[PDB]
Amino acid sequence: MVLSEGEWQLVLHVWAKVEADVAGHGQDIFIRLFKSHPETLEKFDRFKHLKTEAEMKASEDLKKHGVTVLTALGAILKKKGHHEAELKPLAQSHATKHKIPIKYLEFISEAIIHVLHSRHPGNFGADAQGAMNKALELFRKDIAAKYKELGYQG
Numbered sequence: 805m806v807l808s809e810g811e812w813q814l815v816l817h818v819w820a821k822v823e824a825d826v827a828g829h830g831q832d833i834f835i836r837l838f839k840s841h842p843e844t845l846e847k848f849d850r851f852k853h854l855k856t857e858a859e860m861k862a863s864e865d866l867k868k869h870g871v872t873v874l875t876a877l878g879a880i881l882k883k884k885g886h887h888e889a890e891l892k893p894l895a896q897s898h899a900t901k902h903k904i905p906i907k908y909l910e911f912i913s914e915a916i917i918h919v920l921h922s923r924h925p926g927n928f929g930a931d932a933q934g935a936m937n938k939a940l941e942l943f944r945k946d947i948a949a950k951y952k953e954l955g956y957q958g
């Protein structure tokens with residue numbers, strides 16, 4: 805699949821807002837993910853002990869992790885589709901070291917959309933959300949293709 809320049813512009817416009825506070829967006833996204841799909845928390849040995857949202861918000865390590873994840877996702881989005889190089893190491897670590905099913909990538913994509921919708925309604929209308937969903941589906945499609953090449957079905 806391919807996004808038009810117009811769709812990329814909608815994606816990058818709202819992402820520019822996210823970049824005004826990466827750490828804050830990272831926390832909301834992971835808390836949303838862990839609360840909506842608790843099973844995903846079991847994949848993080850470093851955070852699986854967190855019991856409440858209060859504990860999650862207070863975790864310095866979780867906040868730092870969120871910045872690392874969003875920064876990588878941002879680098880990929882800014883390539884506007886030409887992200888083959890950025891995807892390689894990401895796909896290998898998540899398929900071989902962390903063992904993350906495509907299903908879980910769908911869950912975090914939902915968390916991202918939810919948080920952007922909550923925080924940036926003025927820059928995340930129907931068209932912009934459609935553009936973001938398309939960019940995330942492209943991301944998941946390409947990561948899935950790499951998973952297969954690497955020998956991981958998940």
Ligand code: HEM
Nearest residue numbers: 844847848850872873876877894897898902904908909912
């Ligand atoms: C938006 C998609 C995602 C991106 C861009 C992303 C990015 C990253 C990055 C950059 C790291 C650190 C470097 C590395 O280990 O490769 C990381 C670590 C990790 N990711 Fe992801 N990730 C994504 C989705 C997920 C999902 C959905 C899970 C599973 C619920 C997951 C589980 C992990 C784990 C377990 C680690 C190691 C954390 C640690 O022990 O420090 N990731 N991810």
